[PDB]
Design a protein around this nucleic acid. Structure first.
Ligand code: MG
Ligand code: MG
Ligand code: MG
Ligand code: MG
Ligand code: MG
Ligand code: MG
Ligand code: MG
Ligand code: MG
Ligand code: MG
Ligand code: MG
Ligand code: MG
Ligand code: MG
Ligand code: MG
Ligand code: MG
Ligand code: MG
Ligand code: MG
Ligand code: MG
Ligand code: MG
Ligand code: MG
Ligand code: MG
Ligand code: MG
Ligand code: MG
Ligand code: MG
Ligand code: MG
Ligand code: MG
Ligand code: MG
Ligand code: MG
Ligand code: MG
Ligand code: MG
Ligand code: MG
Ligand code: MG
Ligand code: MG
Ligand code: MG
Ligand code: MG
Ligand code: MG
Ligand code: MG
Ligand code: MG
Ligand code: MG
Ligand code: MG
Ligand code: MG
Ligand code: MG
Ligand code: MG
Ligand code: MG
Ligand code: MG
Ligand code: MG
Ligand code: MG
Ligand code: MG
Ligand code: MG
Ligand code: MG
Ligand code: MG
Ligand code: MG
Ligand code: MG
Ligand code: MG
Ligand code: MG
Ligand code: MG
Ligand code: MG
Ligand code: MG
Ligand code: MG
Ligand code: MG
Ligand code: MG
Ligand code: MG
Ligand code: MG
Ligand code: MG
Ligand code: ZN
Lengths: 140, 37, 174, 204
RNA sequence: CCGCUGAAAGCAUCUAAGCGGGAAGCCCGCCCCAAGAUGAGGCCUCCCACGGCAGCCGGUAAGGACCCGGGAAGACC
RNA sequence: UCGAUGUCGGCUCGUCGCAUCCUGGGGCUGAAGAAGGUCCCAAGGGUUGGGCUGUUCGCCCAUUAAAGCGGCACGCGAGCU
C-alpha cells in the first residue's frame, strides 16, 4: 500500500487579528497554516495551505526594547549600502512589513515557500479588501 | 567629565549614581565628576 | 521615613475623582490630570487622599511615594498654584514684559523673546526680577530652566540668569 | 509650484545696469492644460500641459480622443507639472515675473559612449616616461583577491550625456509676453530647439 | 553632554513611571535612475463584441514593424 | 601555493576602519577674555604646492580650517611605469 496523495483541494481563507498579539509568536501559527501542517493531508511539495489574511498588523506587540534595538537591515548592493532600520520606524513607515518579514523567514527557502508567502496578505488597519473571499476568522 | 574604568568617590560630597545603564559620579566639585567608560 | 504612605491633605474646595490609570483634579485655578500606574490604588477619604501599594516589591515601593507626590503636587497647584522667581544679574541686563511674552536684554547681539506656553503666565515686577507662574510643576519648573539657559550664570561674575535663592559661587581670575 | 513647458531657442547676453548678464532664451508659452491630475481620481495633484501644435494627420485616434475630452486642440508634446493647479485653461510665462528664480530641466546634450577622462574627469596616465598605451585609460578598478570583485556604481567609460538634467535657482531676467519668451540668466541644458521645463524654484 | 518634575532611600538624585534641550553625523527634503516592485501598480483616451474546427488556422480593427529621407540621438541596436 | 601566489616606490582609481589632523557638538580646566591643554560623541565632506633622495619615512621652503594614522596579498605590473 502507498501513501495518500491529495488531488487539488480548494484552499481555505483565514482571518487573523494581530492587535495585542506578540510578533514572533504570531508568525509561527501563520507559516504553519501556509505550510498546511495543520491538515491531516499535509504534503511537502504543494501549496496545500490556507491563505492568511492578517489585519491590524500595525498593532503587533513586542517585548523589551525592541522598537529601539531591533534593527531591520538592507544592503543596497553598492558600498556603504548597509541600511540599518529600527523597529520603531518600520511601523511609522511601512508597518505591514514587520510581520511579513517575520513570517517570510519562517517559510522554507526555494520556490515553494516563496509562493507560500504570496498566499500571505498582511494589511495594516481593521479592514481588508478580501471580503469577496469570506475569510474564516481564527482565534489563536 | 572624567571617563575611566576606576570610578570612585573623591570626597565626602561625591555621590555614586547609576544612570541609563551607566555609572556616573556627581559632586559639587565639577572635577570629581566621573563616568565609567 | 516614607512618602507613599503620607496622606494628601486635599484642601477644600479642590476635587479629586479616581479613574484607572489616572486621577483628575479641579481647583480655583484650573484642572489637572495625573496619569498614574494601574498597579497602585488611590483612596479617597474626607478632605484627604492616599495611595496604597499592593506589595513591598521594590517596583511597588518606588512608584508609591512617586504617585503620592504627583497627586499632592497637583493639589497645591490647582489651589495655591506654583511659581518661581528668576534673578537677573548683569549691568546692562534687563527684562521687560512684551504684552504677554518676555524679551530678555542680556548682552547678546539681540533680544531673546520667549513665548509663554499654555498654562504659564509670565510677569515682571522688576526689570531685574521675573516670576514664572502656573498650575503645573514640571512645566513651571521647565520653562524657568529654559529661560535661565539663555544666559546662564557665569563662573567669574554675578552676571547672567539666576534662580531665586541660587548661590553665587564664583572663581578667581588671575 | 508653477511651471511651464518650453523649447530652447538659444542664448546671448544683455546689459542691465552697466553689467553684462549671460542669458538663455526659452520659448515657454503657450501651454494648454489638457488634463488635471487629482487625488481622488488619480491620487495626486498635477497638471498635464500641452506644447507645440501638431499636424492632425500625424495624430492618431487614442491621442486625438484624449485631446477631445479636454476640449484641447492637438499638440506635439505632453509633460506634467506636479503639485500645480492653474485656475485657468491655459498657462503662459506671465506666471513668471522678472527677478524671480526657477529650476530648469532639459535633456542634456548627448556625448555618446564617452571615455573616462571625459565622463568622470579622470587623469589617465602620463603622455611620456614610458606610458604604454594608457594615455587615456582609467587605472586600477579593484584590489586583489579580497574583495576579489569590482564595485557597483563603479566609474568606467560609457554613454554620457543625453540624460535628464535639472538646473536650479536660475534668474528670471525678463519675460517677453508678446512672443512667449522667458529670459533666464545662466546655462540651460540640451541643444537649441530642444525641450525644457521651467518649474518654480525649490531653493530659498 | 545639560536639565524639568521625581520615588525607591522623609534629604538627595536627569530615571526606576513620564516630559524637555542638544552634533557638519542617522531619517525625510534636494538632483538622477527606477513597476523584471514576477508584490510586474495607477490614470486618460482608442479598438471590439470576425469567420472555419483558457487550443489551432485564416482575414481585419486600434495600433505597430519592416522600407526610405534624416537628427547636437547614436559603435550595431 | 616552488608542473610559479611576480616582492620596493611611484602614477591612476578607489573604497573601508576610527585609536579623529580639519570642520561640528560637549564636560573639566591652573577656562578672565582670545588663544591653548586633556578626556568624551561623531567617519559627512575635506586633508595643498614644492626642494633633496629609488625610496616608503623623515628633514626643509611657502602655505593652510587642517596638511591624520591605518586595512584592502606592506590595495592596485592579463591597468602603466
Ligand atoms: Mg492552530
Ligand atoms: Mg511542526
Ligand atoms: Mg499553503
Ligand atoms: Mg516580545
Ligand atoms: Mg506602506
Ligand atoms: Mg586612579
Ligand atoms: Mg572618601
Ligand atoms: Mg550633588
Ligand atoms: Mg476629597
Ligand atoms: Mg483597606
Ligand atoms: Mg528658448
Ligand atoms: Mg524632457
Ligand atoms: Mg553625439
Ligand atoms: Mg564630465
Ligand atoms: Mg576632463
Ligand atoms: Mg595627471
Ligand atoms: Mg608623468
Ligand atoms: Mg595627461
Ligand atoms: Mg616601454
Ligand atoms: Mg605611448
Ligand atoms: Mg586603468
Ligand atoms: Mg592584476
Ligand atoms: Mg569576496
Ligand atoms: Mg542614452
Ligand atoms: Mg531687462
Ligand atoms: Mg541639578
Ligand atoms: Mg530636582
Ligand atoms: Mg523614564
Ligand atoms: Mg526633546
Ligand atoms: Mg528628547
Ligand atoms: Mg534646557
Ligand atoms: Mg528635538
Ligand atoms: Mg553646512
Ligand atoms: Mg523618470
Ligand atoms: Mg508595468
Ligand atoms: Mg521584494
Ligand atoms: Mg500598467
Ligand atoms: Mg544613421
Ligand atoms: Mg603550484
Ligand atoms: Mg611558489
Ligand atoms: Mg600560473
Ligand atoms: Mg598552478
Ligand atoms: Mg572614539
Ligand atoms: Mg572637534
Ligand atoms: Mg571644536
Ligand atoms: Mg589663562
Ligand atoms: Mg586669559
Ligand atoms: Mg576660550
Ligand atoms: Mg575642549
Ligand atoms: Mg569623515
Ligand atoms: Mg577621510
Ligand atoms: Mg608634501
Ligand atoms: Mg627637481
Ligand atoms: Mg631615510
Ligand atoms: Mg638630518
Ligand atoms: Mg594665518
Ligand atoms: Mg584650531
Ligand atoms: Mg609585511
Ligand atoms: Mg615590510
Ligand atoms: Mg605590494
Ligand atoms: Mg602593485
Ligand atoms: Mg608591467
Ligand atoms: Mg610594481
Ligand atoms: Zn567630590
Amino acid at each position: 500500500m502507498k501513501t495518500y496523495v491529495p488531488k487539488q483541494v480548494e484552499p481555505r481563507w483565514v482571518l487573523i487579528d494581530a492587535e495585542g498579539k506578540t510578533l514572533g509568536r504570531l508568525a509561527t501559527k501563520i507559516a504553519t497554516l501556509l505550510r498546511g501542517k495543520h491538515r491531516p493531508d499535509w504534503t511537502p511539495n504543494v501549496a496545500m495551505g490556507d491563505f492568511v489574511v492578517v489585519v491590524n498588523a500595525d498593532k503587533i506587540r513586542v517585548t523589551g526594547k525592541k522598537l529601539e534595538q531591533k534593527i531591520y537591515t538592507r544592503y543596497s548592493g553598492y558600498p556603504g549600502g548597509l541600511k540599518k532600520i529600527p523597529l520603531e520606524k518600520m511601523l511609522a513607515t511601512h508597518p505591514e512589513r514587520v510581520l511579513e518579514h517575520a513570517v517570510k523567514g519562517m517559510l522554507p527557502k526555494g520556490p515553494l515557500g516563496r509562493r507560500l508567502f504570496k498566499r500571505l496578505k498582511v494589511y495594516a488597519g481593521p479592514d481588508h479588501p478580501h471580503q469577496a473571499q469570506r475569510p474564516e476568522k481564527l482565534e489563536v | 567629565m572624567k571617563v575611566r574604568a576606576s570610578v570612585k568617590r573623591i570626597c565626602d560630597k561625591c555621590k555614586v549614581i547609576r544612570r541609563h545603564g551607566r555609572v556616573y559620579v556627581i559632586c559639587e566639585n565639577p572635577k570629581h565628576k566621573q563616568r565609567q567608560g | 521615613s516614607r512618602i507613599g504612605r503620607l496622606p494628601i491633605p486635599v484642601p477644600k474646595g479642590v476635587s479629586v475623582e479616581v479613574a484607572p490609570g489616572r486621577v483628575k483634579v479641579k481647583g480655583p485655578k484650573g484642572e489637572l490630570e495625573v496619569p498614574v500606574s494601574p498597579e497602585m490604588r488611590v483612596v479617597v477619604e474626607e478632605g484627604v487622599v492616599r495611595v496604597e501599594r499592593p506589595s513591598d516589591e521594590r517596583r511597588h515601593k518606588s512608584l508609591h511615594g512617586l504617585t503620592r507626590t504627583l497627586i499632592a503636587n497637583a493639589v497645591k497647584g490647582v489651589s495655591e498654584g506654583y511659581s518661581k522667581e528668576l534673578l537677573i544679574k548683569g549691568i546692562g541686563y534687563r527684562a521687560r514684559l512684551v504684552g504677554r511674552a518676555l524679551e530678555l536684554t542680556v548682552g547678546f547681539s539681540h533680544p531673546v523673546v520667549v513665548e509663554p506656553p499654555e498654562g504659564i503666565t509670565f510677569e515682571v515686577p522688576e526689570p531685574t526680577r521675573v516670576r514664572v507662574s502656573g498650575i503645573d510643576k514640571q512645566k513651571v519648573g521647565q520653562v524657568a530652566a529654559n529661560i535661565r539657559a539663555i544666559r546662564k550664570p557665569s563662573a567669574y561674575h554675578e552676571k547672567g540668569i539666576y534662580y531665586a535663592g541660587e548661590p553665587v559661587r564664583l572663581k578667581p581670575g588671575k | 509650484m508653477k511651471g511651464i513647458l518650453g523649447v530652447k531657442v538659444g542664448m546671448t547676453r544683455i546689459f542691465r545696469d552697466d553689467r553684462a548678464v549671460p542669458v538663455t532664451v526659452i520659448l515657454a508659452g503657450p501651454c494648454p492644460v489638457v488634463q488635471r491630475r487629482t487625488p481622488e481620481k488619480d491620487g495626486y495633484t498635477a497638471v498635464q500641459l500641452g506644447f507645440l501644435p501638431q499636424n492632425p494627420k500625424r495624430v492618431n485616434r487614442p491621442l486625438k480622443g484624449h485631446f477631445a475630452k479636454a476640449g484641447v486642440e492637438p499638440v506635439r508634446i505632453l509633460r506634467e507639472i506636479r503639485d500645480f493647479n492653474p485656475e485657468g485653461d491655459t498657462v503662459t510665462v506671465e506666471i513668471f515675473k522678472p527677478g524671480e528664480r526657477v529650476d530648469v530641466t532639459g535633456t542634456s546634450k548627448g556625448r555618446g559612449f564617452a571615455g573616462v577622462m571625459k565622463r568622470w574627469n579622470f587623469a589617465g596616465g602620463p603622455d611620456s616616461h614610458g606610458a604604454h598605451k594608457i594615455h587615456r585609460h582609467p587605472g586600477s578598478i579593484g584590489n586583489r583577491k579580497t574583495p576579489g570583485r569590482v564595485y557597483k556604481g563603479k566609474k568606467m567609460a560609457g554613454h554620457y550625456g543625453a540624460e535628464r538634467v535639472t538646473v536650479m535657482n536660475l534668474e528670471v531676467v525678463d519675460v517677453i509676453p508678446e512672443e512667449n519668451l522667458l529670459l533666464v540668466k545662466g546655462a540651460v541644458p540640451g541643444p537649441n530647439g530642444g525641450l525644457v521645463i521651467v518649474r518654480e524654484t525649490k531653493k530659498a
